Structures are given as structure tokens and as C-alpha cells.
Design a protein around this ligand. Structure first.
Ligand code: HEM
Ligand SMILES: CN(CCCC(=O)c1cccnc1)N=O
Length: 464
């Protein structure tokens, strides 16, 4: 009959006094130690029920999947999305957009054997660009992002970008900056205080222009497809969506119309770029700091695949150690520490608590990736976390970086394959050197907010 207990809030500022916007995850975790694994917090005027640990997150998003499947808010993005598109929508809109996106994506080979050649081909170009650096110290950021991005770009636009295309880099800076903004102290103040801050000068204004620039580029690309549309030969995700829009022109209550097309396409292009990219970046830093772990990956690539042929997704089954390393890089990297907010569809009873309809919910995936009964050394980089006695791959019920339940990341299939093919191909060809001794390397995060951003760094790609 009652809400989950929590610290007393003040009018408008909510629980701003018990929260440090530079490290929200730590704040919310401190409050958990006092109040328990399920609690109520006020992010400014927003009432949020917070879930910590494997159990409370699973009992909500799995055992009570339908009730907890609404989408909560993410102030910075909502500035742009305003409830349109697959990722920021609710109800019938979310369900039609999701069901359309998963089937259309699957049809383009995504998550099946079909997108595979295209990932091997794009790995190949990156190896080439990496030879082109001659072993210099470089910031790997945009090298990796061009590559990852071209995979989803093919799928939604129809072709990859040239690596030297200047607009491309521009787009890549718009993504990086706006995503990175949500990880900052001001980006977290924005979650609490968007009603005033959207009208105030600050880094938020940069993030908006960057988003608006990403929306404008998508709208332009859609006009191009629209005035060259062959329904009997869809080139890409946008064409498919436009074809379904044609089919649904005589339904006045359809979710399939321009704004949703533009917003869904952005959702896929932005998420299909930024997360995998950052995960690669984080992981190459984790590997230079754990050279012995790098070297056991090497041993597997060398024994199982060798130096001549391209790696393939099927090789994973005989590479338990690489697979554990990628898993443990995703775990340690904790890309979305509070996932995407949810909300409850209706009046919901959850363990003795009552949650009124529309109550926001933070599933704290970071606290699942660090739950001390599922991982022996949660705050350490330890690949043994996903390995048994024998050295065979050991799955974990608490490996939840793509979230779980009805709104789980349907990019998961693409990501798993991109990470696997991108790590093995890169490391088949190059071992890594930083201008720092392993002891000096700081793998603690630069920013922690909506996302976990690794620190700035440089490295060299040295042929093996
Ligand atoms: C390692 C890389 C990735 C991570 C860690 C990740 C993580 C997540 C997480 C935690 C969510 C929230 C699920 C929830 O609301 O409970 C999500 C949603 C989503 N992700 Fe990803 N993702 C990754 C890659 C991708 C890729 C490659 C795509 C493109 C296909 C993508 C597209 C989406 C979309 C469209 C949603 C919204 C789902 C919905 O609202 O129904 N993600 N992702
Ligand atoms: C990047 N991450 C999703 C973050 C929220 C999201 O899905 C999103 C955010 C901005 C634009 N498009 C999608 N998913 O992999």
C-alpha cells in the first residue's frame, strides 16, 4: 500500500542534498546501504523507485515483466525525442516500433549469419587504417568509431561512409559529445533540473545542437531514399520503414509515419555506434594494463584461427578465454550503470511496496554487474569471472549489460558479434603498446553518469 522507503526530499529539489551529480551511481549506492535494495529517490520533482542487486532487478524486469516494461525518462534525449522512436516511446507506439525493428533488422541479416560478411569486411578496412598509422601513438577513438558505425550505417543507410568523409567525423563528434554529456556532473544536474536548465546557457546547449544536427542529418537521408524508393527492392532500414508507411497510408491510427521513422533511425544509428565503440576503447585500455591477459588472448587467436584467415563468429565456441575477456570488459566497463529508465504501466504491487502508475524505475545494472554473490572480485578486472575449473566459458545470471525483460537491448545480437569479430581481428594483427608502464595506467572512469566514459588516452598498434 506504501512506496519503498527512502531519504526525505525537499520540494522541487527532491533528494539533491543526498546526491552528488558527479557520481550518481555512488550516491544511489550509498543510500541503498542505508535503506535497502529497493528505495525511493527524488531526482528533482521526479519520483523514482531504485532497484539494486541481481534479485530486485530480476524480480522486477523479468518476473513482473509486463508491469515494469514502460520507458522512464532521460532528460537530455527527450529534449529531442519527445516520446517518438523505438527507444523513447511507450505503449502501442513502443510495441509496434520494436516489433517492426526487430523483424526488419533480422531480415537484413542482423543477429543471424547474414550481417556477418559485412562485419568481416569492415574489420578488414580497420586493420588497413591501422597499418596506415605506422605504429605511431594515436588516440584510437575515431578509428574505432568510424568502423563500428559503418556496420549499422550500411544497414540503415544502405552503404558505408568513406573513412575520410568529413561529415561522417562531424556526426561521430556529435554522438560522442552528446552521449558523453549525459555522463557528466552537469548532465546529471540536467536530469533533475531540465525544466529550468533547458533555457539556461551551459554544456546542455552544446548537447542539444549536437542532437539536432544528428536529427537533421537523418531527415536529409530519408528525403533522399523517399524520392528514389523502389518498393520491390528495399535498399535498407529506412526503405523498409517507408514501405510499411506506404502499406499503412490507409490507417489513420498507425505508428508508422515520418517522425517515428526519423527517430527510430536515429536510435539505431546512435546506439549502433556509441556503445560498442566505447566498449572497444575501454577494453584496449584494460588490455594494455593487463598484458598477461592480452597474451592469453593472443595464444587463443594463434592456436584456433591462426594468422591467415579472417576470424568468424563460429570460432567463439572454441575460444572460451577470449569470450570471457570480452564478457569481463563489458562487465567492468559498465556502460550504462542505471540502464535506461523504466516506468510502471499500471498500479503495481512489488514486494510489499506499492508503485502508482507512471512511477519511474531505475534498474541499476551496474550493481548487478558488481553484485558480490555473482562475482568473486567485483571491482577488479578478472576474466576468471566467466571461466570454470577447466577454462571453459561460464555464463553468469548477473551478466546483464544489455538489460533484461521486455525492453532488453535488441542490439544485443549485433553487439556480441561486432565485439567478437572486432576484438579478434584487431588482436590477430596487432598487439598494443601505451606510452605508459602498466602500473601507471588509470582504468578508473573519466565520467560516470548515464554512461561510463573511459579516460582519454593514446596507444600504438604494432604488427605481431
Ligand atoms: C555493447 C553495446 C550495447 C549495450 C551495452 C547496450 C545496452 C542497452 C541497454 C542497457 C538498453 C536498455 C534496455 C532497457 O530499457 O531495459 C538498451 C536499449 C536499446 N538499445 Fe542497446 N546496447 C548496445 C548496443 C546496441 C546496438 C548495436 C544497437 C543497434 C541495433 C542498440 C539499440 C538499442 C535500442 C533501439 C534500445 C531501446 C530498446 C527499447 O526501448 O525497446 N544497442 N541498450
Ligand atoms: C546507446 N544505448 C542506448 C542509450 C539510449 C538509446 O537507446 C539512445 C539514445 C540516443 C539516441 N538513440 C538511442 N544503447 O545501446
Amino acid at each position: 500500500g506504501k512506496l519503498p522507503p527512502g531519504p526525505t526530499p525537499l520540494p522541487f529539489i527532491g533528494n539533491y542534498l543526498q546526491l552528488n551529480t558527479e557520481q550518481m551511481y555512488n550516491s544511489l549506492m550509498k543510500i541503498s546501504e542505508r535503506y535497502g535494495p529497493v528505495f525511493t529517490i527524488h531526482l528533482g520533482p521526479r519520483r523514482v523507485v531504485v532497484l539494486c542487486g541481481h534479485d530486485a532487478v530480476k524480480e522486477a524486469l523479468v518476473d513482473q515483466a509486463e508491469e515494469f516494461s514502460g520507458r522512464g525518462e532521460q532528460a537530455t534525449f527527450d529534449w529531442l525525442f519527445k516520446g517518438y522512436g523505438v527507444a523513447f516511446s511507450n505503449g502501442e507506439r513502443a510495441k509496434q516500433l520494436r516489433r517492426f525493428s526487430i523483424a526488419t533488422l533480422r531480415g537484413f541479416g542482423v543477429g543471424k549469419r547474414g550481417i556477418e560478411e559485412r562485419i568481416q569486411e569492415e574489420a578488414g578496412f580497420l586493420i588497413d587504417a591501422l597499418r596506415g598509422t605506422h605504429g605511431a601513438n594515436i588516440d584510437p577513438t575515431f578509428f574505432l568509431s568510424r568502423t563500428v558505425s559503418n556496420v549499422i550505417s550500411s544497414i540503415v543507410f544502405g552503404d558505408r561512409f568513406d573513412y575520410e568523409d568529413k561529415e561522417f567525423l562531424s556526426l561521430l563528434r556529435m554522438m560522442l559529445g552528446s552521449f558523453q554529456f549525459t555522463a557528466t556532473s552537469t548532465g546529471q544536474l540536467y536530469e533533475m533540473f531540465s525544466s529550468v536548465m533547458k533555457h539556461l546557457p551551459g554544456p546542455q546547449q552544446q548537447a542539444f545542437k549536437e542532437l539536432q544536427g544528428l536529427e537533421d542529418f537523418i531527415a536529409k537521408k530519408v528525403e533522399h531514399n523517399q524520392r528514389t524508393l523502389d518498393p520491390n527492392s528495399p535498399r535498407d532500414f529506412i526503405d523498409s520503414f517507408l514501405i510499411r508507411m506506404q502499406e499503412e497510408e490507409k490507417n489513420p491510427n498507425t505508428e508508422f509515419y515520418l517522425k517515428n521513422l526519423v527517430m527510430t533511425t536515429l536510435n539505431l544509428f546512435f546506439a549502433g555506434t556509441e556503445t560498442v565503440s566505447t566498449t572497444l576503447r575501454y577494453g584496449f585500455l584494460l588490455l594494455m594494463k593487463h598484458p598477461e591477459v592480452e597474451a592469453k588472448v593472443h595464444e587463443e587467436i594463434d592456436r584456433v584461427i591462426g594468422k591467415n584467415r579472417q576470424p568468424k563468429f563460429e570460432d567463439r565456441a572454441k575460444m572460451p578465454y577470449t569470450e570471457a575477456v570480452i564478457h569481463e570488459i563489458q562487465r567492468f566497463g559498465d556502460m550504462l550503470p542505471m540502464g535506461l529508465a523504466h516506468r510502471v504501466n499500471k498500479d503495481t504491487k512489488f514486494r510489499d511496496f506499492f508503485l502508482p502508475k507512471g512511477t519511474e524505475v531505475f534498474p541499476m545494472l551496474g550493481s548487478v554487474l558488481r553484485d558480490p554473490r555473482f562475482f568473486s572480485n567485483p571491482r577488479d578486472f578478472n576474466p576468471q569471472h566467466f571461466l570454470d575449473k577447466k577454462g571453459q566459458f561460464k555464463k553468469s545470471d548477473a551478466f546483464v549489460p544489455f538489460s533484461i525483460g521486455k525492453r532488453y537491448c535488441f542490439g544485443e545480437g549485433l553487439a556480441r558479434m561486432e565485439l567478437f569479430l572486432f576484438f579478434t581481428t584487431i588482436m590477430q594483427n596487432f598487439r598494443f603498446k601505451s606510452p605508459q608502464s602498466p602500473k601507471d595506467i588509470d582504468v578508473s572512469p573519466k565520467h560516470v553518469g548515464f554512461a561510463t566514459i573511459p579516460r582519454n588516452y593514446t596507444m600504438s598498434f604494432l604488427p605481431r
